[PDB]
Design a protein around this nucleic acid. Structure first.
Ligand SMILES: [Mg+2]
Ligand SMILES: [Mg+2]
Ligand SMILES: [Mg+2]
Ligand SMILES: [Mg+2]
Ligand SMILES: [Mg+2]
Ligand SMILES: [Mg+2]
Ligand SMILES: [Mg+2]
Ligand SMILES: [Mg+2]
Ligand SMILES: [Mg+2]
Ligand SMILES: [Mg+2]
Ligand SMILES: [Mg+2]
Ligand SMILES: [Mg+2]
Ligand SMILES: [Mg+2]
Ligand SMILES: [Mg+2]
Ligand SMILES: [Mg+2]
Ligand SMILES: [Mg+2]
Ligand SMILES: [Mg+2]
Ligand SMILES: [Mg+2]
Ligand SMILES: [Mg+2]
Ligand SMILES: [Mg+2]
Ligand SMILES: [Mg+2]
Ligand SMILES: [Mg+2]
Ligand SMILES: [Mg+2]
Ligand SMILES: [Mg+2]
Ligand SMILES: [Mg+2]
Ligand SMILES: [Mg+2]
Ligand SMILES: [Mg+2]
Ligand SMILES: [Mg+2]
Ligand SMILES: [Mg+2]
Ligand SMILES: [Mg+2]
Ligand SMILES: [Mg+2]
Ligand SMILES: [Mg+2]
Ligand SMILES: [Mg+2]
Ligand SMILES: [Mg+2]
Ligand SMILES: [Mg+2]
Ligand SMILES: [Mg+2]
Ligand SMILES: [Mg+2]
Ligand SMILES: [Mg+2]
Ligand SMILES: [Mg+2]
Ligand SMILES: [Mg+2]
Ligand SMILES: [Mg+2]
Ligand SMILES: [Mg+2]
Ligand SMILES: [Mg+2]
Ligand SMILES: [Mg+2]
Ligand SMILES: [Mg+2]
Ligand SMILES: [Mg+2]
Ligand SMILES: [Mg+2]
Ligand SMILES: [Mg+2]
Ligand SMILES: [Mg+2]
Ligand SMILES: [Mg+2]
Ligand SMILES: [Mg+2]
Ligand SMILES: [Mg+2]
Ligand SMILES: [Mg+2]
Ligand SMILES: [Mg+2]
Ligand SMILES: [Mg+2]
Ligand SMILES: [Mg+2]
Ligand SMILES: [Mg+2]
Ligand SMILES: [Mg+2]
Ligand SMILES: [Mg+2]
Ligand SMILES: [Mg+2]
Ligand SMILES: [Mg+2]
Ligand SMILES: [Mg+2]
Ligand SMILES: [Mg+2]
Ligand SMILES: [Mg+2]
Ligand SMILES: [Mg+2]
Ligand SMILES: [Mg+2]
Ligand SMILES: [Mg+2]
Ligand SMILES: [Mg+2]
Ligand SMILES: [Mg+2]
Ligand SMILES: [Mg+2]
Ligand SMILES: [Mg+2]
Ligand SMILES: [Mg+2]
Ligand SMILES: [Mg+2]
Ligand SMILES: [Mg+2]
Ligand SMILES: [Mg+2]
Ligand SMILES: [Mg+2]
Ligand SMILES: [Mg+2]
Ligand SMILES: [Mg+2]
Ligand SMILES: [Mg+2]
Ligand SMILES: [Mg+2]
Ligand SMILES: [Mg+2]
Ligand SMILES: [Mg+2]
Ligand SMILES: [Mg+2]
Ligand SMILES: [Mg+2]
Lengths: 112, 249
RNA sequence: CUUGGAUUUACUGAAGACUAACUACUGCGAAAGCAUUUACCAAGGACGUUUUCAUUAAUCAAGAACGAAAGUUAGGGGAUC
RNA sequence: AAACUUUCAACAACGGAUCUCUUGGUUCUCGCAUCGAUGAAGAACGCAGCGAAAUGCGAUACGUAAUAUGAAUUGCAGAUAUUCGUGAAUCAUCGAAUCUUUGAACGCACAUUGCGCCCUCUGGUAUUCCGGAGGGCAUGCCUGUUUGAGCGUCGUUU
RNA sequence: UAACGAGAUUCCCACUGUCCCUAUCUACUAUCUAGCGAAACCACAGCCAAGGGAACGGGCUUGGCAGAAUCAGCGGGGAAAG
RNA sequence: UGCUGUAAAGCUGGGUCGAACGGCCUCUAGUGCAGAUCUUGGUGGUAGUAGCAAAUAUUCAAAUGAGAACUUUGAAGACUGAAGUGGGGAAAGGUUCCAUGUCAACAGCAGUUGGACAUGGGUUAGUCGAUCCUAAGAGAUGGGGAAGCUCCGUUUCAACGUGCUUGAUUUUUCAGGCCAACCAUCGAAAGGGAAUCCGGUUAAAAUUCCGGAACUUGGAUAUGGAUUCUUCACGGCAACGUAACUGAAUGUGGAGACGUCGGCGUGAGCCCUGGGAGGAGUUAUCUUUUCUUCUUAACAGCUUAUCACCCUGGAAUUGGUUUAUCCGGAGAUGGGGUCUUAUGGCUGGAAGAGCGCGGUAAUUUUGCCGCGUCCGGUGCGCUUACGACGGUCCUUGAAAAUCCACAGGAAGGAAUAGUUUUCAUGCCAAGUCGUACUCAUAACCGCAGCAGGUCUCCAAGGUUAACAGCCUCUAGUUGAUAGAAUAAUGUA
RNA sequence: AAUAGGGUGAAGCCAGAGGAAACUCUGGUGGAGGCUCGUAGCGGUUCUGACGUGCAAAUCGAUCGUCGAAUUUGGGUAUAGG
RNA sequence: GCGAGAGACCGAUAGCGAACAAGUACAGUGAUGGAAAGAUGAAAAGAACUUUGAAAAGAGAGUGAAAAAGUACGUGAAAUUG
């Protein structure tokens, strides 16, 4: 079987010196240098991978259209759907109770 | 003779602490207007392991009272503190586990941790896992509080000094044997270069005051004066007594 | 142990134990045992019953729970004996 | 008796003593006062028609100008080189210049020929981007200029 | 004191050239040739016996003797060398 | 050759030689050698002696040449045997690389050969590195020590921006609006990080040249599309979808960005294998046989997934489910969908290339022509990448540059027309330095062409548990002074 | 950055059997450990082997220790002569 | 340092380490360490030419006052050698 060599001066099996073995149209087995695998964009609240967003190495996000990097919703490319849903309900319910605690306080500011 | 291993540590070449993996200095907030007059509320975001520390640390996010910004504090996690808990710090904070209160605002018998020796030093006493400070009493006329430290010492602190209600998490760590030299190796791999220890009696007279002899033996009393000099203080320094501790102290 | 103030005296404080007198030919618990107040938790005998079920019971090799004091292991306390 | 060994002589070797030289050294005396931010001493790299070194020099590179002098240089070659002359050769003299990358070494950095910013001109359809040319941007301190700060403080007006 | 040990020791089984008691075989040397070619060491040198002697001589004294040039081995001596 | 003197020595004949030198009276001293394990230089005996014995192994012929054990070519015999005696690199060397010539010295024999000697030639980048970032750390400044060389300190008891963003102004003046926690600098050719592949080409260079096909960053900029009269788009219950589809200060997050082990799953390359179309070998006999070619890069489009998520529904007779027992009224099973595109598939790239055959051209620079290059299968296989999981720790396994999204709502926006370069297409540019070769039983370090030492990548068949040992294919070597014998004593 | 192939078989989990209970037994599964045999690697026990004017100012051969962690190792960095 | 004049000084193992392409070659990671090495002849007139040899060389010849001066260069001792 044919054996391959690195294509660069780095001779060490480091994280940035990973290779694949690819057969060329010349009928040759050569080494192909593999870029580091991209990590998924994750939610800032729960830490889970966000759906609908491309998995790219950070500089590659600058050269891609906006639909790949976001979701059409509040906090689209930043928070997941369930964490946005919990924010909305929490914001509404807590602010509703703020009014209740205010009118109740005014009830004790005129009789006690 | 030679400079002994005691004295080489002060230069701190290979005897500095290994601090790459540490998660920040555990401190209370800077004492500000909100804590002096009312309370401020933060939320626990993380409870994390700090390498070299038995106690877990808590990451608590507060709002900045003066500019639009979030402030992340590194507290020592008290046992029972959970992620998403609201932490209240100040004079008007309530007596709940994890809240930071001035010492005068805590009744006698309150178990408190990460207590300030001085007002605003952000925590000195009772910071290791399983340890705490007991509030003995108050002296409101002099604005002083009596506390009991983990060593059993009684201390008088300003009533404005702060502490965190509860016991430091991670207690009971010492109950389990290490069982292995490798376990101590991994323990000190992220603390400092103090392990393993060669016995001075097993060295030569250049290396140690205990070295030398046709048998391994100290040769003179191993209780050393407090007024002895560097290179002599090897053994039991200023030992009031020696031998097996029998009865109460 | 004490003229370096002992013992004694008053006030104040801290520690651990222990619950006097009331306390008995009295009570409770399977036994060992159990004695300051209050709260909580789950038990129990007796009594009362024109309630209910109907033999489900008695004693029990094997096998289990508890078991004063002393004693052992590891922490904490260690006043008194 | 040969051979061999040893001794001696002649000639030849090996080796570089001896002799004789000497643009070097050493010591003494006499005279003089002249390094550098106007960038020194030192370093690196280059430069000749044909050179590796030494010597000289710096992209004007074994040298340019000037003054003097007066026919060479030379190992070879060769003038769009020269001879009763602005004229061969010449660190003869020397007063004008050139003087790479550096170095106290100065935009920042330097195990990198790494990275800026400002001004003028210029090329690319450009106040902004890319290229080129030239000129600049270190620190301490002194004098002065300008712009400021402080209820340190003077005057005045509510 | 179970387990562990290139730690020290004794015994037993197995095993064997450790031995009785040695023999045989192979390759590479050594050996001879062509080419190449050091070093240690060196007062002068180089046969013994006795004597005396710095009390253990190659040399001196008295004897034995003694015949060119040499090769492979060898480890008694050179109170061999370092 | 002799003479004189007890002697130290003096004089003289002959030979050699080529430029200075002596006697006597005095002066002066760095003034006399056999030794010092003396110093420096030179030369012997030893001695043509010890020796030139590890790494299986060489042989025949031709060519060349004065000369061949050793050079070249051919034939053979062997070995390394993929954890190599193969193919590359890091450090280190520095021209050892290649061609031509060449043998005085060196290559402990030799030499026609060479890493020797001489003359020339040779290293091509926007995409590979450096350059940039920060790591442990190093270290200016403001200060504080110290007689001082300098020491401490790294934002520190400091009035610390050579600040930006706009509307501009052409009045080359400005008007302001925001901030200034932190932030000198150096520190990785194995960490982080913008972007390139295939085929061909040299005596020697190639991810650099040639041909073709791409990509990123920075800048400029027009057209098309998109959007607006409900000004800054629509669709989907939803997960979310799309060619686009305003968004300042400030803020919040994400990526960068992370241990180790275990089994499992998927892919890729390799191994194995069937048919067919070619070529080679064996053929006394047998063998529809043995070996071999049948390939497809970066990049573009569409499609493709475990996990996760959404809608429906409401579960004990508990069900689903992994090799590994975890999940479900905090909503399982069932039904239907959404997403990441790792990875594969199809197509373009692209057959025009490469490969395998056949037929012809010719001193001939170099070819020209035709045919084929297709369809499968298999797995506790090997290596490697990824995935979903599980175990483990008094151990929990970097940072920064940089990029993006979101929150916020400043400011500016249409109708006879307005906006945007996160949609498509088009235009310009990408500097500097490294790049040859060795990487080792001869290119590094051990005084040397030294059995030592010196970091790492790829890895075929058989046997086997095995990447062991043993044999073999590709590739590479056949290098180590040789000849003749075969005593003793050795060494193995 | 590197570390063949085996053995043993810890928790956890599944099933069956026995028991009044407290609980016990069996078969699997699983894949723990500064566990173990043993390569590479790292080391250096013995022959008191070779060599000992060496291949070598520490090597060569066999034998041996260890071989998934207190492991091995490149580069960067820190510590400097009482 | 610059510029001069001198000596009962040394005469190439001496005198400065260096009379010469000497602080050179070379060593060492580094601080540093640190040589050896002058002489043909007045003049290259540095041996044309012939011959043997693969060549280096040799033998004739030639130049020179001398080749008993041939760059392995004045003289040319001793050890050592034919
Ligand atoms: Mg999207
Ligand atoms: Mg200890
Ligand atoms: Mg110890
Ligand atoms: Mg000792
Ligand atoms: Mg001492
Ligand atoms: Mg003492
Ligand atoms: Mg002692
Ligand atoms: Mg002892
Ligand atoms: Mg009672
Ligand atoms: Mg009773
Ligand atoms: Mg019984
Ligand atoms: Mg008891
Ligand atoms: Mg106790
Ligand atoms: Mg007691
Ligand atoms: Mg002389
Ligand atoms: Mg650098
Ligand atoms: Mg034992
Ligand atoms: Mg043992
Ligand atoms: Mg051991
Ligand atoms: Mg012999
Ligand atoms: Mg005698
Ligand atoms: Mg005798
Ligand atoms: Mg003798
Ligand atoms: Mg005689
Ligand atoms: Mg002998
Ligand atoms: Mg012998
Ligand atoms: Mg004469
Ligand atoms: Mg004469
Ligand atoms: Mg003369
Ligand atoms: Mg005279
Ligand atoms: Mg003398
Ligand atoms: Mg002498
Ligand atoms: Mg000598
Ligand atoms: Mg000799
Ligand atoms: Mg011999
Ligand atoms: Mg030998
Ligand atoms: Mg051949
Ligand atoms: Mg083989
Ligand atoms: Mg070559
Ligand atoms: Mg030779
Ligand atoms: Mg020869
Ligand atoms: Mg050469
Ligand atoms: Mg790159
Ligand atoms: Mg750059
Ligand atoms: Mg730092
Ligand atoms: Mg200063
Ligand atoms: Mg840097
Ligand atoms: Mg880098
Ligand atoms: Mg990293
Ligand atoms: Mg890198
Ligand atoms: Mg190519
Ligand atoms: Mg090449
Ligand atoms: Mg191209
Ligand atoms: Mg662009
Ligand atoms: Mg649309
Ligand atoms: Mg894990
Ligand atoms: Mg894995
Ligand atoms: Mg690519
Ligand atoms: Mg295609
Ligand atoms: Mg497969
Ligand atoms: Mg691997
Ligand atoms: Mg675009
Ligand atoms: Mg190359
Ligand atoms: Mg070697
Ligand atoms: Mg050396
Ligand atoms: Mg492999
Ligand atoms: Mg093998
Ligand atoms: Mg040999
Ligand atoms: Mg032989
Ligand atoms: Mg294993
Ligand atoms: Mg060994
Ligand atoms: Mg030995
Ligand atoms: Mg020997
Ligand atoms: Mg072994
Ligand atoms: Mg290191
Ligand atoms: Mg003189
Ligand atoms: Mg001299
Ligand atoms: Mg000298
Ligand atoms: Mg001479
Ligand atoms: Mg001839
Ligand atoms: Mg003469
Ligand atoms: Mg002469
Ligand atoms: Mg002569
Ligand atoms: Mg003689």
């Amino acid at each position: 079987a044919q054996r391959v060599t690195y294509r660069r001066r780095n001779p060490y099996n480091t994280r940035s010196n990973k290779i694949k073995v690819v057969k060329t149209p010349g009928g040759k087995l050569v080494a192909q240098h593999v870029k580091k695998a991209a990590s998924r964009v994750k939610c800032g609240d729960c830490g889970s991978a966000l759906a609908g967003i491309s998995t790219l190495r950070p500089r590659q996000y600058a050269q891609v259209s906006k639909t790949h990097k976001t979701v059409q919703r509040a906090y689209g490319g930043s928070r997941c759907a369930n964490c946005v849903k919990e924010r909305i309900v929490r914001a509404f319910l807590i602010e509703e109770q703020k009014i209740v605690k205010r009118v109740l306080k005014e009830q004790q500011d005129k009789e006690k | 003779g030679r400079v002994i291993r005691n004295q080489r540590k002060g230069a701190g070449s290979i005897f500095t602490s290994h601090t790459r993996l540490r998660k920040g200095a555990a401190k209370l907030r800077t004492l500000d207007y909100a804590e002096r007059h009312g309370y401020i509320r933060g939320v626990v975001k993380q409870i994390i392991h700090d390498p070299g520390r038995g106690a877990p640390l808590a990451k608590v996010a507060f709002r900045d009272p003066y500019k639009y910004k979030l402030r992340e504090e590194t507290f020592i996690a008290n046992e029972g503190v959970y992620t998403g808990q609201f932490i209240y710090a100040g004079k008007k904070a309530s007596l709940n586990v994890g809240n930071i209160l001035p010492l005068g605002a805590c009744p006698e018998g309150t178990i408190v941790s990460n207590v300030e020796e001085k007002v605003g030093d952000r925590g000195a006493l009772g910071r290791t896992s399983g340890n705490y400070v007991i509030i003995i009493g108050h002296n409101p006329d002099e604005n002083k509080t009596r506390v009991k430290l983990p060593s059993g010492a009684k201390k008088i602190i300003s009533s404005d000094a702060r502490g965190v209600i509860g016991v430091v998490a991670g207690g009971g760590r010492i109950d389990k044997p290490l069982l292995k030299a490798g376990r101590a190796f991994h323990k000190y791999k992220v603390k400092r270069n103090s392990w393993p220890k060669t016995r001075g009696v097993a060295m030569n007279p250049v290396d140690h005051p205990h070295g030398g002899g046709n048998h391994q033996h100290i040769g003179k009393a191993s209780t050393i004066s407090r007024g002895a000099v560097s290179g002599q203080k090897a053994g039991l320094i200023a030992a009031r007594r020696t031998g097996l501790l029998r009865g109460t102290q």
